[PDB]
From TrEMBL:
InterPro entries: PSM_alpha, PSM_alpha_peptides. The keyword rRNA processing does not apply. It holds the Pfam family PSMalpha. It comes from the Bacteria. It comes from Staphylococcus aureus. The gene is psm alpha-3. This is Phenol-soluble modulin alpha 3 peptide.
Length: 22
């Protein structure tokens, strides 16, 4: 499920670009 993991990681990183990574 590496493809699905990469999808979630991409959107988490996008969220972090506006809201931080905490």
């Amino acid at each position: 499920m590496e493809f699905v993991a990469k999808l979630f990681k991409f959107f988490k990183d996008l969220l972090g670009k506006f809201l931080g990574n905490n």
